[PDB]
Amino acid sequence: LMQFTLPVRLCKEIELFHFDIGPFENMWPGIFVYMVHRSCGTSCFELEKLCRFIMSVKKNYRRVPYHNWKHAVTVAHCMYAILQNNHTLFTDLERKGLLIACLCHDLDHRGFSNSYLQKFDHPLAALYSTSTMEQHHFSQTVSILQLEGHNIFSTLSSSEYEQVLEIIRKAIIATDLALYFGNRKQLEEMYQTGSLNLNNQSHRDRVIGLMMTACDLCSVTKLWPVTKLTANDIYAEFWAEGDEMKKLGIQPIPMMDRDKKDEVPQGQLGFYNAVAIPCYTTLTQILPPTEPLLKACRDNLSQWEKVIRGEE
Ligand SMILES: Cc1nc2ccccc2nc1-c1cc2nc(N3CC[C@@H](F)C3)cc(N(C)C3CCOCC3)n2n1
Numbered sequence: 001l002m003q004f005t006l007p008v009r010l011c012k013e014i015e016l017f018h019f020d021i022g023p024f025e026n027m028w029p030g031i032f033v034y035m036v037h038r039s040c041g042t043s044c045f046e047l048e049k050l051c052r053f054i055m056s057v058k059k060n061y062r063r064v065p066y067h068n069w070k071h072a073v074t075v076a077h078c079m080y081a082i083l084q085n086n087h088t089l090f091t092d093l094e095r096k097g098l099l100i101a102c103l104c105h106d107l108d109h110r111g112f113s114n115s116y117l118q119k120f121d122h123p124l125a126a127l128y129s130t131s132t133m134e135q136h137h138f139s140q141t142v143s144i145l146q147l148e149g150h151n152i153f154s155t156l157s158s159s160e161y162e163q164v165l166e167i168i169r170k171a172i173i174a175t176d177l178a179l180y181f182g183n184r185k186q187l188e189e190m191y192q193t194g195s196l197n198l199n200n201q202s203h204r205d206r207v208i209g210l211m212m213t214a215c216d217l218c219s220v221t222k223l224w225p226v227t228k229l230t231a232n233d234i235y236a237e238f239w240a241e242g243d244e245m246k247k248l249g250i251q252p253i254p255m256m257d258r259d260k261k262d263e264v265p266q267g268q269l270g271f272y273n274a275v276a277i278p279c280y281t282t283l284t285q286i287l288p289p290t291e292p293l294l295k296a297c298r299d300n301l302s303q304w305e306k307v308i309r310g311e312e
């Protein structure tokens with residue numbers, strides 16, 4: 001049968017946590033299939049259904065600056081690297097579920113936070129009172145899975161199918177950064193008091209949640225030019241949201257105000273110290289081979305410090 005392959009530089013570098021999927025959009029589907037085949041197997045999905053699923057997922061991402069198809073694939077590659085470095089800790093269903101979850105986790109994102117949907121009074125905020133966009137992303141995932149010839153899970157049993165959709169729902173809900181803080185605090189305590197148990201389903205759930213945050217934030221773990229240029233796409237969205245907050249007569253948070261451009265370097269420090277570093281720290285304690293993500297994050301924090309000190 002038909003192994004997907006990649007050019008040599010990509011074949012080698014795709015295995016590393018810091019890999020950038022590149023600017024050639026038409027190669028991103030092949031990169032994902034390559035990752036499913038190596039992390040899951042050539043037998044995991046019917047190639048034809050998988051190809052049709054990927055192309056419908058792509059079409060349901062919007063041309064926004066950051067929360068786009070390139071983010072989806074980027075977040076899947078970080079998951080792939082985690083799974084390939086922790087081969088024997090994950091069930092076959094988890095391998096299957098989590099790459100699809102990462103590809104789908106921001107489906108039909110519009111470039112706005114949960115908070116802006118609530119203040120605009122968007123219909124999605126009446127349908128889903130918390131984790132508004134994330135419940136929408138899971139709903140879009142199930143919609144696409146139910147299109148004719150798109151059910152990539154059709155060969156599982158009733159209960160394996162319910163389990164995989166449950167892995168995907170939880171993984172996608174965990175990408176709500178509002179739930180990250182409390183999830184990591186709990187994982188921290190469970191690990192330090194030695195009560196963390198990967199046979200306890202509700203513990204595994206928490207560990208997958210943290211893996212989803214880690215993959216979602218993985219732009220902070222890249223080569224500095226990738227990090228810094230991705231930061232520009234993130235702020236293009238934040239600042240548009242700020243603009244839309246001012247049109248509703250609401251002063252945006254500093255993060256989203258384009259008048260406070262000059263503070264970006266310091267806001268990045270806040271984010272690395274409050275979110276990213278503690279995320280990759282706890283992840284590294286639970287899964288030692290993910291340590292390269294913590295080290296790259298620490299390297300990028302020190303590049304932001306250099307931007308403040310005027311050395312870059
Ligand atoms: C939320 C995010 N997500 C990323 C994901 C990937 C890559 C970079 C990412 N950066 C950010 C990000 C950007 C940013 N800019 C800030 N300021 C304040 C005014 C001006 F100086 C820029 C302040 C913050 N906070 C301190 C956040 C602390 C954690 O909860 C949300 C608030 N953040 N966080």
Ligand SMILES: [Mg+2]
Binds near residue numbers: 105106133175176
């Ligand atoms: Mg999201």
Ligand SMILES: [Zn+2]
Binds near residue numbers: 071075105106175216
């Ligand atoms: Zn995301």
